[PDB]
């Protein structure tokens, strides 16, 4: 029941405090005369073990410890959008403004959001004094910026009746916006909601994936598509084109919120993203608006302590889940969760928890699942019957670039879609360097129905694309010894067709206008054309071999060099400088040219 | 029986990790179930891990978080875990802990049993005597499953083994209809399915598919999403096996239990061991994993004097496609037979990608025979395997020898290869083939050659079946 403790001991970041028995697991405390935030992680009798969040140098035995009855939490309110945050949600920009200094003072204490800025509130205009309301009900709107109107709602697990609603006008998070009366008691509320980070917000119901996710990399979009509300993981020792992927998904998608959480990042890398991303812009309704209006960032450099690394991912996904509850579509991008697992291994090791395999505690898999499985499409609580979703793209930095490590095995065993990246293709500079053989995605079958209702053509073309690419791989595995001497005619057609698929339609140049983004229909057109010429060439050679005057690839190259050149040059049908009509008519006209040339050679 | 009031303690000598240590408990016993009530009102269950004098330790199921020292109640039950088994559980859906989740009522228990089960006397074992049909032509024709055989299914991450499992579930059954359908109407067959360590998409897919097939009146279902507490992972199998036992030997039925993702079982068991502070064994997995998997697998077979049986089809994934990984190694040692799926075949867009070349069986010789099936099974299987092996190695030969030097019989072998992979193996998710259809297709594929090449078939059956 006491309120003050003492610091009995210290050893690295792990201290031991005495004279506190009225405390429980995973509450917050303040340590020393610097007021460092710490969390309880173990208990024994009267004593306890705290993990302090900032550096510990100089803390002496006998310092006070001011407990607070509240677990780790993440504030959520207007202004959260278009800002930068640390692991514990602490605005770096506000700090640099306040101190006017270059460093992080130890134990800065500033509110996560603003407390002196007025927004324009607009109540829901459908609730009068005395109306009943449960949790999750929208009751107002606030214009965050030109592109997003931050919805306001009551927290879950709360209900009552209406007492007072402020008229529309300028208010701020300090004053009272709503007033409610529960049966027997009364309470007031403000724009700000505080939520425990290691707790899953409730939902009405969960729904199947029903619409794909748009991206610019035709690789892993026609090959291993990922779905809206979907889960996947980008392996690779570094973000090999990964930053370009997030940037493109921002530039081109139906998404509404874009939360990129950095963890264990190199200093100049986050300097890169903070310099470049804010200056990227995009036309929404013919007006060019910065992508910051629909982006949040949670930086955490490598020199940050261990517990901040642990906290960053959870706070990020709490933000994402809250925005998903707001009735939007969301996309998140983790970054270097391998170092996060390593950080967890360290903090386990200091506490004398018996390791299992390579030092990784056994319960890492459970935590790993507890993170990823938050993703998915949902119907949301509340009167409006709104709808939302959230899709997480992970990041695994495997030690040694293989599957041996427990972390990569465990994350592989629970992620729906795997996006294995070849090291050899990364050395070949045919970017993006996707393996196309060790990868998979469990979203083919659901999207079959979608692609039948809208296109009726994509599924067989795609399946044949896989078959031809794979047969090329197998014939490559065969020909290594005989030096391609035994390449027959059909083998030659297969080899050339899949080689063309590799060269023209399995690699893009992200630094050029004709390659930064390919829509679905454009991919479908190019793939249709590929399967078309394969089909006609195979039909011609078979018919002529059966009947008379066999047709070999030499006469084929001779007569239709123009067709093949046009087919390679489809890649450069710049949608940036040309409309959809021109390029689609080009694809159709090249298909007809191929038809006419094959008729001529028949 | 029990009539004493229960105790409850407000003593907490400490907490650490997923455990909670207390003391001053009167006459504690091991494996006693314990309830808990937190300051905020939440209720959580648990079990007793350690006991030493008046000291006790309890591993909280739901995960430890926010447990105060002084404000915490801890009620004791005084009994080990007991399952409320009941025949009426068919048509229901449960979670790992056994709480229903399909908006239905709590099970009106018909009898209480021990979760652990009891070893079955080897004296009262009965050898299997007859086969079953799973609905897959590739499996029934080429690799028989007897009543009481324990056949695992090795797969790997990224393959459609779950779809194969669902297909097996919605089509498993018997073939007693050889003589008459009138005597076949007496059906006494059921399936119990234990999805464990499964992600959310697959859980929903299973629930939807099982509900769609329309035969939910004889399917029990247990779900344990990967969110749920890790300890519930290693309690789901025990509930499923106890239910299967009660149905098999108290209702004289014919039950087929199908377990999923035993790798997740192994991982959960590993975590329990490491939390329990025990010394690691080989590869970080505990030493007694063999004994544990033995006590899970060994609950099946047939019992003398009881008209019933239990058949096991566990599934598991091989990390890194490594056949010498301990989990598949021990699983192979304890069980009889094995079935493979191969990456390449799935990568040829062939469904189900079932690679019969390394697939074996242990009781095929005695599962099949005159009466329970046709007289033309074993020879047909041998001939199909021999023809296919010839065809594949012969394709390997023609890869370099050139197609021009091939004989015409060589083209017949290639024709056999392509047709066998086009029709016999490929079936499609809903093409419910029976055993007799499977043998019909087998004979049709064999018809390509003359009986002279078919040197594994006896002439006596050649004079009957070959000229069809």
């Amino acid at each position: 029941e006491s309120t003050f403790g003492y610091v009995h001991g210290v050893s690295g970041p792990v201290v031991t405090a005495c004279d506190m028995a009225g405390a429980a697991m995973y509450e917050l405390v303040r340590v020393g005369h610097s007021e460092l935030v710490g969390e309880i992680i173990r208990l024994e009798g009267d004593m306890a073990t705290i993990q302090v969040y900032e550096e510990t140098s100089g803390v002496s035995v006998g310092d006070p410890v001011l407990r607070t009855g509240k677990p780790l939490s993440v504030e959520l309110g207007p202004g959260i959008m278009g800002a930068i945050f640390d692991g514990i949600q602490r605005p770096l920009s506000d700090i640099s403004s306040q101190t006017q200094s270059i460093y992080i003072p130890r134990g800065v204490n500033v509110s996560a959001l603003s407390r002196d800025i007025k927004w324009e509130f607009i109540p829901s205009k459908n609730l009068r004094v005395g109306s009943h309301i449960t949790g999750g009900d929208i009751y107002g709107i606030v214009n965050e910026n030109s592109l997003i109107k931050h919805k306001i709602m009551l927290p879950p697990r709360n209900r009552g009746s209406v007492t007072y609603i402020a008229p529309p006008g300028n208010y701020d998070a300090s004053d009272v916006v709503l007033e409610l009366e529960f049966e027997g008691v009364k309470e007031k509320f403000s724009m700000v909601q505080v939520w425990p980070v290691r707790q899953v917000r409730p939902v009405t119901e969960k729904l199947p994936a029903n619409h794909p996710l748009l991206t610019g990399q035709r690789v892993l979009d026609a090959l291993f598509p990922c779905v809206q509300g979907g889960t996947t993981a980008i392996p690779g020792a570094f973000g090999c084109g990964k930053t370009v992927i997030s940037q493109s998904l921002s530039k081109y998608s139906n998404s509404d919120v874009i939360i990129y959480v950095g963890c264990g990042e190199r200093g100049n890398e986050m300097s890169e993203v903070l310099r470049d991303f804010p200056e990227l812009t995009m036309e929404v309704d013919g007006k060019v608006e910065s992508i910051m209006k629909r982006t949040a960032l949670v930086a955490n450099t490598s020199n940050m302590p261990v517990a901040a690394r642990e906290a960053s991912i959870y706070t990020g996904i709490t933000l994402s889940e809250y925005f998903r509850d707001m009735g939007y579509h969301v996309s998140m991008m983790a970054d270097s969760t391998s170092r996060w697992a390593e950080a967890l291994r360290e903090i386990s090791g200091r506490l004398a928890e018996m390791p299992a395999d390579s030092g990784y505690p056994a319960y890492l898999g459970a935590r790993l699942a507890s993170f990823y499985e938050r993703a998915g499409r949902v119907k949301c609580l509340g009167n409006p019957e709104r709808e939302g979703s959230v899709s997480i793209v992970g990041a695994v930095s495997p030690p040694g670039g293989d599957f041996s490590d427990p972390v990569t095995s465990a994350t592989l065993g629970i992620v729906q879609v795997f996006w294995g990246l070849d090291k050899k293709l990364a050395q070949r500079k045919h970017f993006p360097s996707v393996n196309w053989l060790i990868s998979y995605s469990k979203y083919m079958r659901a999207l079959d129905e979608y692609y039948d209702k809208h296109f009726t053509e994509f599924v067989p073309l795609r399946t044949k694309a896989k078959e031809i690419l794979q047969e090329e791989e197998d014939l490559a595995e065969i020909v290594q010894l005989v030096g391609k001497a035994s390449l027959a005619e059909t083998d030659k057609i297969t080899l050339e067709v899949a080689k063309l698929i590799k060269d023209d339609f399995l690699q893009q140049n992200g630094y050029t206008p004709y390659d930064r983004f390919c829509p679905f229909y454009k991919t479908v057109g190019m793939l249709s054309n590929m399967i078309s010429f394969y089909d006609m060439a195979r039909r011609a050679v078979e018919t002529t071999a059966q009947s008379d005057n066999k047709i070999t690839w030499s006469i084929i190259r001779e007569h239709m060099g123009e067709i093949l050149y046009k087919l390679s040059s489809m890649k450069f049908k710049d949608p940036v400088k040309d409309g959809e009509a021109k390029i689609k008519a080009d694809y159709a006209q090249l298909l007809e040219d191929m038809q006419n040339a094959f008729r001529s050679l028949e | 029986y029990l009539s004493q009031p229960r105790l409850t303690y407000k003593t907490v000598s400490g907490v650490n990790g997923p455990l909670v240590i207390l003391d001053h408990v009167k006459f504690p016993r091991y494996a006693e179930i314990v309830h808990l009530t937190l300051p905020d009102g939440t209720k959580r269950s648990g079990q007793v891990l350690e006991v030493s004098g008046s000291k006790a330790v309890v591993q909280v199921f739901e995960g430890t978080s926010g447990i105060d020292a002084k404000k915490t109640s801890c009620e004791f039950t005084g009994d080990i875990l007991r399952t409320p088994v009941s025949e009426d559980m068919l048509g229901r859906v449960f979670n790992g802990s056994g709480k229903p989740i399909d908006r239905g009522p709590v099970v009106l228990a018909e009898d209480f049993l021990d979760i652990m089960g009891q070893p079955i006397n080897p004296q009262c074992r009965i050898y299997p005597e007859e086969m079953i049909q799973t609905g897959i032509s590739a499996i029934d024709g080429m690799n028989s499953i007897a009543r009481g055989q324990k056949i695992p299914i090795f797969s790997a991450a990224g393959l459609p083994h779950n779809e194969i499992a669902a297909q097996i579930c919605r089509q498993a059954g018997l073939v007693k209809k050889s003589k008459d359908v009138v005597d076949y109407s007496e059906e006494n067959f059921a399936i119990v399915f234990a999805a464990m360590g499964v992600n959310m998409e697959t859980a929903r897919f299973f629930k939807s598919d099982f509900e769609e097939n329309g035969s939910m009146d004889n399917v029990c279902l247990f779900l344990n999403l990967a969110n749920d507490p890790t300890i519930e992972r290693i309690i789901t199998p025990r509930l499923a096996l106890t239910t299967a036992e009660f149905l098999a030997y108290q209702c004289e039925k014919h039950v087929l239990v199908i377990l999923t993702d035993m790798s997740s079982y192994a991982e959960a068991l590993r975590e329990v061991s490491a939390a329990r502070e025990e010394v690691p064994g080989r590869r970080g997995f505990p030493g007694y994993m063999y004994t544990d998997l033995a006590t899970i697998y060994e609950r099946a077979g047939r019992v003398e004097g009881r008209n019933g049986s239990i058949t096991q089809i566990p599934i598991l994934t091989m990390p890194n496609d490594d056949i010498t990984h301990p989990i598949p190694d021990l699983t192979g040692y304890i069980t009889e037979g094995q079935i493979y799926v191969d990456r390449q075949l799935h990568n040829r867009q062939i469904y189900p990608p079932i690679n019969v070349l390394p697939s074996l069986s242990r009781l095929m010789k005695s599962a099949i025979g005159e009466g329970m099936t046709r007289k033309d099974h074993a020879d047909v299987s041998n001939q199909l395997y021999a023809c296919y092996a010839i065809g594949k190695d012969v394709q390997a030969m023609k890869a370099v020898v050139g197609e021009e030097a091939l004989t015409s019989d060589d083209l017949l072998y290639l024709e056999f290869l392509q047709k066998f992979e086009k029709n016999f193996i490929t079936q499609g998710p809903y093409e419910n083939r029976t055993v007799y259809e499977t043998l019909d297709i087998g004979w049709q594929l064999l018809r390509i050659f003359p009986k002279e090449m078919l040197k594994r078939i006896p002439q006596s059956t050649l004079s009957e079946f070959y000229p069809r």
């Binding site: 004398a352 018996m354 | 010394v279 690691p280």
Partner: peptide, 13 residues
Amino acid sequence: FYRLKKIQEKKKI
């Protein structure tokens, strides 16, 4: 394995 065992034994004291 051995070094972990020795930690375990040391912790008994």
